[PDB]
């Protein structure tokens, strides 16, 4: 009485890289919860809210190949005058206006979202590594209620 | 040289609101572990179990705009006669029956899961605020072994 | 050689306030051990047990800004008829029944757990100040064996 | 001026069982921090390390229904001849080699990770209960630097 | 004027039992400082060390319900041939080997750490009672330097 | 009968390193409570509050492979000219402004949070070792009430 049935399907995602380190499986696709923000704290150009931090791990590093590392982000800018601010993208209607998302480097400086400007270097050691990062909102004009979600991709430079 | 490889993706979640307080990032989406409960403690209609507490945190409050707040929950009722009991929803097979989840206010009273009846008001103060809540199982009959998971959403009224 | 290895992570907790005093580090989050109690001493409604003492310590107080302080406690009541009794919350099963936790002021009167009614005032002095408090069990009926854990939050008023 | 705004989502997790006791909400999903271990302490097959303890707590126990309890762990073995040694799993790259984790019973003996061989029985009493356990590393050869995380599941027998 | 500031959190721990006596708050959870021991005194199997005393205090005892009391200890044994010796557990590294902790009854004998074999009975009187105990090291083989932390739990059997 | 039921999941976390010592399980992930601080003590740039101490514990040290150790910290700075000040990150709504966190060394000097500038070396001994550290707030300007949470990571050099 075997009583064999059909179970389903399993999908595997991965990548093979020729580099000194390998990005951790928990950092290739992660979601950061920023939380709600009051419009009273975003009332003029240049106003910023508080910051939320996230990390990127590097496994199996080898210092005999490379000793430094840097991360550069790529995404859609809010306009041509603010090249370091992300643009919100949730749906056709519902997103807020005159607001964006900034990414702060290890030195507290905003990162240009062009995919070529890399962050500050960080010395590595054999084994696991961690590179800190922060995110925050950045008002451009008068903020309005709505949703605020954004996506971005990053690349790593070992040298 | 300077080896560059592809990295991953980062997804940002948030919301902008026009209110006197903002929900904390750790309270927008949280899970509560109720733990196991014996069927012998749920034998007849109206029987309950011990409660488990969870909190909702409000940040950056201002008492010059509003001085009180209330929370109303929304979810699927278990029956037309039990409007204040949630219904279990995990999968198509392998869930308990004749049991539900109740949400208790800070006055020990059950909350109607219609999204309109708000809980008891609580005086706020400038800065961080916390609102207590409790959850417990409610039996509408004879309990049956199985899984017990539920979901609900809340809204905040700043009166 | 050097032989550098990965270490760990350190988390820092704190708060910046605008008031005459500041809560001590050991009083921000503390645990009070009530100890066991016999059901024979809790037989009917209104019965109480012995009290266990705890205190809140204030630091860097200044008498030129404020002169008196008071504390209000917020928590989940046991029912609508007993607003000064805190409800137990440990897990889904294994908690005692028809029993709660009462918090007594330095005057010996139980405080309502609504976050608005403050305790009796106490004159302060420059430097370190401590405010005494007591906790005891309270029975609303025939007590049953089980666990008895509870949590509460407090706010400080500087009048 | 109600000024109602959207909040968030709450997820509830639990289970209903027909047994003499119920597992504590704090023991259905727990993390054990083993800490770092030097490679010099793991040089040949069969070499172990120091132990770290963890507990499983049972609530609302009834002696009439049952008087003894035992558990059995299920997980992925590291090898065909090492069925009592759990295999590490953290990511594709960056994990220690030739080493696993062992789960010791209250009699100091290892446990087969097949989900069928239960541990030594323990007498119960009415109310809460605690069962002790220990975990340690186990070398199957020359150890290699890396990360070491693992997972397992357990079941309870109320004989 | 009326500056209100958020404070902190208070946690209460306790238990309600149906028995003749209740355990004092100072004996529910306590730490015993054994101090350092030279490895020269622990050189072969069966070697012991000097004893360190600790007490378990019972409150509100009644001589009508019960007349005598006894306790049993439950913990992880060091080996299958040594069932009355605890096993050291502090971390994955830096712990002593071939050394365990032995608990002695008021009669001078060592108790088995199975949670079923209770110690010698002790006559009680109305009011407060204390039960003496002693702890010492026990060498299974040749001692090695390291830490010697341990933990255990006890149950009281009124009769 | 047996009446076997389902339990839960156990998560094990650890690391295997090739170094002179190993970090204790209690020091790889710890929380430090700083307590509240008044804005009156943080009014100008360079003003500092009191200090709170914490330790990093090393186990199973060997004095034949290495004799001295050092610790370097990594985190997100608050400004380009304040590389020795850590930035606050709790949420996107409520956090103190112009206030950071400094990490002092056993020499009393602040450490640069770049992950390369190690602290002052300390002589080790065979067995357990402890390295002291202190943390404090640092004001870059006029302080603002809010939360003051922060995180950081460290690495060890066994020179």
Swiss-Prot record, chains A, B, C, D, E, F:
User: What disulfide bonds does the UniProt entry report for this chain?
Assistant: 21-61
- Assigned GO CC terms: pilus
Question: What does the UniProt entry say about where the protein is found?
Answer: Fimbrium
Give yes or no: UniProt keyword Translocase: no
Keywords, ordered alphabetically: Disulfide bond, Fimbrium, Signal
* Purpose of the protein: Fimbriae (also called pili), polar filaments radiating from the surface of the bacterium to a length of 0.5-1.5 micrometers and numbering 100-300 per cell, enable bacteria to colonize the epithelium of specific host organs.
User: Which family does this protein fall into?
Assistant: Belongs to the fimbrial protein family.
Q: What is this protein called?
A: Type-1 fimbrial protein, A chain
Q: Which gene encodes it?
A: fimA
